[PDB]
Amino acid sequence: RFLKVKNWETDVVLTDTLHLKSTLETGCTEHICMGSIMLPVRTKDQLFPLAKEFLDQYYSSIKRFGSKAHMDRLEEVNKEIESTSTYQLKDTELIYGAKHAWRNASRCVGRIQWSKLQVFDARDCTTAHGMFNYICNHVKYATNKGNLRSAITIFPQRTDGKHDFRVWNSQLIRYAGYKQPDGSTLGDPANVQFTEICIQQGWKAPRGRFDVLPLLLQANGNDPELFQIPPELVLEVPIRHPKFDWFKDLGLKWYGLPAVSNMLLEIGGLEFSACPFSGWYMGTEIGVRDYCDNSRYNILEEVAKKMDLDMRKTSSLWKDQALVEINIAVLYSFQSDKVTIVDHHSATESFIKHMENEYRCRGGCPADWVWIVPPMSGSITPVFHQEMLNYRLTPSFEYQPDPWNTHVWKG
Amino acid sequence: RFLKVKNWETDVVLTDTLHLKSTLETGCTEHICMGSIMLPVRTKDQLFPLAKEFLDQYYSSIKRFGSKAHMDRLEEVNKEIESTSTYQLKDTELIYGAKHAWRNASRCVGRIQWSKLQVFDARDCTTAHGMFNYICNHVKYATNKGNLRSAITIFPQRTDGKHDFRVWNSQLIRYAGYKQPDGSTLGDPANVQFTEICIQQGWKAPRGRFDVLPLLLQANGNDPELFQIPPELVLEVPIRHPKFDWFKDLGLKWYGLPAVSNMLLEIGGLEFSACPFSGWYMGTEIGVRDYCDNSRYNILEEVAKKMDLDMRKTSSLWKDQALVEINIAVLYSFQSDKVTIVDHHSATESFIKHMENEYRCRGGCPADWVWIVPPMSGSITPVFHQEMLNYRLTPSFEYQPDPWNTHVW
Numbered sequence: 001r002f003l004k005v006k007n008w009e010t011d012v013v014l015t016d017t018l019h020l021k022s023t024l025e026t027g028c029t030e031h032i033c034m035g036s037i038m039l040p041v042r043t044k045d046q047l048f049p050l051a052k053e054f055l056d057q058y059y060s061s062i063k064r065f066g067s068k069a070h071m072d073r074l075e076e077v078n079k080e081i082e083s084t085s086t087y088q089l090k091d092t093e094l095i096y097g098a099k100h101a102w103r104n105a106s107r108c109v110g111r112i113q114w115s116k117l118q119v120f121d122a123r124d125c126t127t128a129h130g131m132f133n134y135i136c137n138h139v140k141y142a143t144n145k146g147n148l149r150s151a152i153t154i155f156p157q158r159t160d161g162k163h164d165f166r167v168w169n170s171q172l173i174r175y176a177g178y179k180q181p182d183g184s185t186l187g188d189p190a191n192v193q194f195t196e197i198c199i200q201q202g203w204k205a206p207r208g209r210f211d212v213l214p215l216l217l218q219a220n221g222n223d224p225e226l227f228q229i230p231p232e233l234v235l236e237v238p239i240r241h242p243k244f245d246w247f248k249d250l251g252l253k254w255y256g257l258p259a260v261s262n263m264l265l266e267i268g269g270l271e272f273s274a275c276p277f278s279g280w281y282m283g284t285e286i287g288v289r290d291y292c293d294n295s296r297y298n299i300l301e302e303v304a305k306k307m308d309l310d311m312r313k314t315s316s317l318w319k320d321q322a323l324v325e326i327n328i329a330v331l332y333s334f335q336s337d338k339v340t341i342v343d344h345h346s347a348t349e350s351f352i353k354h355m356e357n358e359y360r361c362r363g364g365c366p367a368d369w370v371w372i373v374p375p376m377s378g379s380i381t382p383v384f385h386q387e388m389l390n391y392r393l394t395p396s397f398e399y400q401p402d403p404w405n406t407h408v409w410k411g
Numbered sequence: 412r413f414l415k416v417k418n419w420e421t422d423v424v425l426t427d428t429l430h431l432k433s434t435l436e437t438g439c440t441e442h443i444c445m446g447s448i449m450l451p452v453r454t455k456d457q458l459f460p461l462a463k464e465f466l467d468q469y470y471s472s473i474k475r476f477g478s479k480a481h482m483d484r485l486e487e488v489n490k491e492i493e494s495t496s497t498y499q500l501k502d503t504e505l506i507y508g509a510k511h512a513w514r515n516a517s518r519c520v521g522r523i524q525w526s527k528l529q530v531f532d533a534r535d536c537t538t539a540h541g542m543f544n545y546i547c548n549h550v551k552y553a554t555n556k557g558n559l560r561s562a563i564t565i566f567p568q569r570t571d572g573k574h575d576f577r578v579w580n581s582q583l584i585r586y587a588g589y590k591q592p593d594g595s596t597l598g599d600p601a602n603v604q605f606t607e608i609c610i611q612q613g614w615k616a617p618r619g620r621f622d623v624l625p626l627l628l629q630a631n632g633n634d635p636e637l638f639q640i641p642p643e644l645v646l647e648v649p650i651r652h653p654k655f656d657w658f659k660d661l662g663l664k665w666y667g668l669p670a671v672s673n674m675l676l677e678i679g680g681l682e683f684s685a686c687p688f689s690g691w692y693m694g695t696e697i698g699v700r701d702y703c704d705n706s707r708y709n710i711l712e713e714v715a716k717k718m719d720l721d722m723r724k725t726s727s728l729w730k731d732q733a734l735v736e737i738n739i740a741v742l743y744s745f746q747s748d749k750v751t752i753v754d755h756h757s758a759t760e761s762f763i764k765h766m767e768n769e770y771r772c773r774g775g776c777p778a779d780w781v782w783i784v785p786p787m788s789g790s791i792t793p794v795f796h797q798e799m800l801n802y803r804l805t806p807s808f809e810y811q812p813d814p815w816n817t818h819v820w
């Protein structure tokens with residue numbers, strides 16, 4: 001079965017055969033589409049098929065499919081599963097798996113970079129202190145003094161689901177948020193609940209607008225532990241504007257390293273519940289979402305006041321004017337400090353080229369249009385005009401619920 | 412089977428039950444989502460269930476479900492289908508049907524308006540000249556000297572499908588497009604093909620940049636014929652900027668009346684293949700899409716240059732800057748000439764209100780996020796943060812392929 005996608009700007013038509021390798025469900029049925037819904041313990045029985053499917057993919061990719069090395073590895077895994085109920089990935093397999101999970105991540109606009117990913121194998125980690133050290137090294141390697149390098153650090157897999165490794169932080173680097181008694185928030189309203197957990201865990205909060213949060217790390221199903229990332233490891237960029245000199249006096253800054261730490265990595269049926277990963281920012285992430293979302297730093301009004309825009313009617317497009325200036329500022333600031341960043345025009349153009357390459361060499365590229373299209377200037381980016389098929393390949397990254405809702409506190 | 416939608420900005424969660432009445436298929440499966448794909452006669456016994464499903468929802472709406480008068484109409488329609496192979500809607504049923512097709516239109520951000528729709532019943536029409544008359548009357552009514560009113564004009568229903576009424580134009584009012592010896596395109600590059608079909612049929616093109624196209628109208632499955640809309644019925648707006656004096660020098664204008672004319676209206680299993688409808692513009696349609704799309708008028712480069720912005724690197728956001736100014740100019744010009752227009756902020760805020768009314772009054776509101784989120788400044792509009800469920804309810808508007816592909820002459 002063949003599915004076609006058209007680009008409405010170019011009239012380029014692509015053929016997808018890769019969707020035929022899709023296993024998991026989308027959330028959609030032929031009666032309902034859930035494309036804009038954000039969120040639409042395994043047996044040996046379910047595990048060997050999954051291991052086999054993975055090892056089969058790995059071995060075809062190295063062109064060893066059917067080899068003796070191939071057949072011996074199947075049998076080896078087969079026997080490990082029957083005897084220990086699970087199995088361990090070889091290093092080569094883990095690397096290929098982590099890369100492919102990124103490749104398969106349909107909400108990620110940055111995937112042209114997928115084959116360049118530094119994998120750190122932290123499967124020998126046993127404690128939170130060990131996790132802390134591993135994550136420091138990741139941040140230092142990835143930051144590279146502003147010349148950012150993609151990386152992922154992989155902690156031990158789920159066993160009985162009672163001994164999970166987890167990073168409680170949703171990103172390794174983020175700013176505290178403090179709900180004030182007057183109902184206003186200080187710092188990042190997205191992080192209020194987590195900040196409150198940190199405090200109750202004994203964090204001494206500075207109570208400023210940009211306090212870097214402490215890591216909260218769970219090893220082996222244990223209660224999580226607080227660690228402060230060394231400040232000298234946390235690269236930050238004060239935000240200023242090339243034309244407007246009052247921009248700097250808004251007091252804004254952001255961290256250079258976007259590092260997702262709450263996702264679950266699945267390779268060959270195995271589940272890595274702690275697999276923090278990082279690349280670099282696309283500017284709209286900070287300038288549109290982090291700064292201008294109403295429920296985030298929400299700076300639109302203050303920027304527009306300073307700009308003396310006509311604010312009495314939405315139809316002056318004052319919000320849109322201030323939005324563009326803030327985004328110019330973010331890109332200018334990162335560039336001036338030599339911290340890696342990509343603008344949304346460049347990133348989407350690169351994604352379209354990646355997407356076409358993948359169709360030619362792989363028979364497809366699952367993509368989620370809802371997330372790929374930047375949150376400003378959508379239709380002046382080529383991804384707006386590009387039809388996409390969204391489906392699920394493994395290896396994969398999955399959202400998992402925040403651990404404070406699930407953790408069995410040991411005390 | 413009962414589904415929740417969350418707004419991530421506000422935390423308001425709504426429960427959808429309306430989807431369990433959905434009938435048509437989406438294109439999505441459990442394995443593949445086609446949410447971003449633009450494009451994902453009836454026999455006697457196909458038509459009766461369709462009529463019944465409609466008449467049931469109609470009688471329920473006027474709170475006479477299961478009433479003597481309900482059962483009597485179901486009977487009358489049954490008799491009429493068995494004997495005539497189709498049936499005729501009562502005026503009341505047609506009006507309700509059309510308002511509901513709009514209400515069910517999951518791609519449409521302006522549905523807060525769905526109940527205020529003037530329906531022109533053109534089912535007595537029989538020639539193309541008649542179609543032209545009807546359409547000028549629609550154009551003049553809806554335009555209302557710039558105080559726009561929503562309207563639809565419904566021509567006769569499909570029969571054996573060898574006698575369709577069709578408006579060949581995709582919209583009642585649009586601009587011609589011609590390829591040049593130089594190789595670029597003059598006017599709207601999206602209408603090049605249609606403009607060639609008009610000249611083929613005898614239109615003498617002014618051969619300018621903003622030439623209102625003629626109507627090509629098809630009555631009763633006949634070869635289509637050409638008519639010019641009276642120039643004085645086409646309200647156009649010169650585009651200027653409130654601060655950039657040079658903007659007017661681009662020589663840009665756009666028409667005030669957006670009027671879609673290639674859709675198929677399906678009510679109670681009957682198919683109205685010529686049903687032009689019109690409301691009023693959200694500014695982004697013109698300013699973002701019509702003017703800035705690369706394969707449309709594609710004017711970004713020229714505006715950016717007149718603004719003296721840094722066009723050397725994508726990261727200066729020159730495109731983004733120019734885009735906003737173009738959209739300020741559309742909105743300002745329409746407002747100055749007192750022609751109804753809505754900005755994307757106000758439109759999307761009204762739609763959130765509409766969603767909330769529909770969830771509580773009707774149990775849901777089908778909505779296609781990919782179309783509903785404006786093509787600029789997406790996440791500063793409230794619809795970006797609103798989860799939506801997309802499903803197909805009937806009565807409905809459905810896209811039709813361009814008829815020059817169908818028709819034989």
Ligand code: HEM
Pocket residue numbers: 098102105107108109110111113117150151152263277278279280281282285342347371397399
């Ligand atoms: C190297 C530069 C990269 C860029 C510019 C980039 C860009 C992005 C952006 C803009 C998003 C949407 C983010 C959001 O809106 O919250 C995203 C999502 C995502 N990316 Fe990337 N990405 C990069 C690297 C990576 C890496 C290194 C990985 C994994 C190894 C990754 C995996 C993911 C996943 C799993 C998502 C979905 C996240 C979620 O569901 O919350 N990306 N990417």
Ligand code: HEM
Pocket residue numbers: 513516518519520521522524528561562563671674688689690691692693696753758782808810
């Ligand atoms: C009253 C002012 C109205 C506003 C502001 C409005 C707004 C819009 C917008 C922005 C779109 C997306 C159009 C595009 O991107 O091409 C749209 C689509 C649509 N609307 Fe409306 N609308 C209005 C009136 C109407 C009326 C009166 C009807 C039917 C009687 C209607 C039915 C539809 C349908 C069927 C679509 C999808 C069309 C397609 O598939 O091309 N709308 N609406």
Ligand SMILES: Cc1cc(N)nc(C[C@@H]2CNC[C@@H]2OCCNC[C@H](F)c2cccc(F)c2)c1
Pocket residue numbers: 038039110171258259260277278279280281282285399
């Ligand atoms: C509910 C829910 C589900 C889901 N899958 N995900 C979320 C995180 C949201 C997505 N939108 C904001 C926030 O996630 C913010 C973090 N995203 C950073 C991005 F993925 C990125 C960029 C560059 C490099 C890199 F490694 C990573 C929430």
Ligand SMILES: Cc1cc(N)nc(C[C@@H]2CNC[C@@H]2OCCNC[C@H](F)c2cccc(F)c2)c1
Pocket residue numbers: 449450582669670671688689690691692693696810
């Ligand atoms: C391939 C295809 C499928 C489909 N359903 N539709 C199309 C028309 C495209 C969609 N997007 C731009 C263009 O259609 C432009 C016409 N849109 C006008 C809009 F619906 C509107 C606004 C305000 C009032 C009103 F009555 C109508 C093409």
Ligand SMILES: C[C@H](O)[C@H](O)[C@H]1CNc2nc(N)[nH]c(=O)c2N1
Pocket residue numbers: 035036037038370371372419795796797798799
């Ligand atoms: C409801 C909707 O799915 C939600 O707001 C999505 C829309 N698109 C997005 N796109 C990206 N990249 N990141 C997001 O958080 C979201 N949020």
Ligand SMILES: C[C@H](O)[C@H](O)[C@H]1CNc2nc(N)[nH]c(=O)c2N1
Pocket residue numbers: 008384385386387388446447448449781782783
């Ligand atoms: C491929 C994608 O579906 C296509 O470009 C859509 C995206 N969203 C849209 N949204 C609206 N309102 N109108 C459109 O024409 C489109 N085009």
Ligand SMILES: [Zn+2]
Pocket residue numbers: 028032033034035439443444445446
């Ligand atoms: Zn879908």
